[PDB]
Design an enzyme around this catalytic site. Structure first.
Site, PDB file in Angstrom:
ATOM      1  N   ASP A  66       0.774  -1.191  -0.002  1.00 14.52           N
ATOM      2  CA  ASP A  66       0.047  -0.095   0.026  1.00 14.52           C
ATOM      3  C   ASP A  66       0.885   1.201  -0.077  1.00 14.52           C
ATOM      4  O   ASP A  66       1.982   1.218   0.300  1.00 14.52           O
ATOM      5  CB  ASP A  66      -0.841  -0.029   1.219  1.00 14.52           C
ATOM      6  CG  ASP A  66      -2.101  -0.961   1.064  1.00 14.52           C
ATOM      7  OD1 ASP A  66      -2.330  -1.529  -0.120  1.00 14.52           O
ATOM      8  OD2 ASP A  66      -2.393  -1.713   2.310  1.00 14.52           O
TER       9      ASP A  66
HETATM   10 CL   LIG Z   1      -2.689  -3.187   6.599  1.00 13.26          CL
END
Ligand SMILES: [Cl-]
Ligand SMILES: [Ca+2]
Ligand SMILES: [Cl-]
Ligand SMILES: [Cl-]
EC number: 5.4.99.-
Length: 261
Positions: A66
């Site tokens: 991410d």
């Molecule tokens: Cl996470």
């Protein structure tokens, strides 16, 4: 984006953690997304040519991190090797270790959070609370199996450095399991703190004082979630470890947390 991509690619070269005939392992910086705004995918052709010359075809993604995660990220020269590594992740053959600073100290200090997650991510437990009593709710059809092992490495009375091993690979599972499962949100996790995704994380007077911040500046605290280690089976094992980012090191020191021995 090319000018910016070139500069980023050079920065990534300076931080390379491991290189062999198959893989290039980078240290992904804070805030850089994998997919598109400059992203990792934009620099795969550039980094390839930077490392192997003008005939080089692009590097390939093997797994994702991410945007607000830092640290170990494996790239492959060959598409089939990328697929091989992707399959190692899919089949849970790779040990993935993350380090996080949490607000509050997990209890127990080591364990496993195995509550399923439903996707906007939330937990999906076996029961519901109505007027203070538990009512069984049938497992949601879209709930995904989610398992996170954790171990506190260092703690004060109010903060912890926590090692996390997601066994599964569900979106935001570490953040959701820590915040909602343990009531120990990651430092800087505005989205998953205080049951209000739009509000900045609420920190105590003492924690703010340790950090040297006024509450008005809490909204600018970054997430503290680092992909510390990956152990890949033979393509003997490849055991990849990444230093913590300077900001994370600083927060550890300010919060009076120690590195494990
Ligand atoms: Cl996470
Ligand atoms: Ca919040
Ligand atoms: Cl706090
Ligand atoms: Cl370190």
């Amino acid at each position: 984006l090319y000018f910016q991509g070139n500069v980023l690619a050079k920065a990534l070269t300076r931080g390379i953690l491991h290189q062999d005939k198959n893989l290039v392992v980078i240290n992904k910086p804070y805030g850089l997304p994998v997919h598109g705004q400059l992203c990792i995918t934009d620099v795969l052709p550039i980094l390839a040519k930077m490392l192997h010359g003008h005939k080089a075809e692009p590097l390939h993604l093997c797994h994702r991190l991410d945007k607000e995660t830092t640290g170990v990220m494996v790239l492959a020269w060959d598409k089939d090797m990328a697929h091989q590594v992707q399959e190692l992740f899919r089949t849970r053959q790779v040990v993935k270790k993350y380090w996080a600073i949490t607000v509050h100290v997990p209890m127990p200090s080591a364990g496993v959070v195995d509550i399923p997650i439903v996707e906007k991510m939330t937990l999906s437990p076996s029961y519901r609370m109505d007027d203070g009593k538990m009512v069984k709710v049938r497992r949601s059809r879209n709930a995904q199996v989610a398992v996170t092992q954790y171990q506190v490495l260092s703690s004060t009375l109010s903060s912890a450095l926590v090692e996390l091993q997601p066994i599964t690979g569900i979106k935001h599972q570490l953040r959701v399991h820590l915040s909602f499962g343990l009531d120990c949100p990651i430092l800087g996790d505005h989205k998953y703190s205080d049951w209000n995704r739009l509000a900045p994380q609420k920190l105590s007077v003492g924690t703010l004082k340790k950090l040297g911040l006024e509450q008005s500046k809490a909204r600018y605290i970054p997430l503290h979630l680092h992909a510390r280690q990956l152990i890949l089976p033979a393509l003997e094992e490849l055991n990849l470890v990444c230093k913590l980012p300077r900001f994370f090191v600083h927060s550890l020191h300010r919060l009076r947390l120690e590195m494990p021995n």
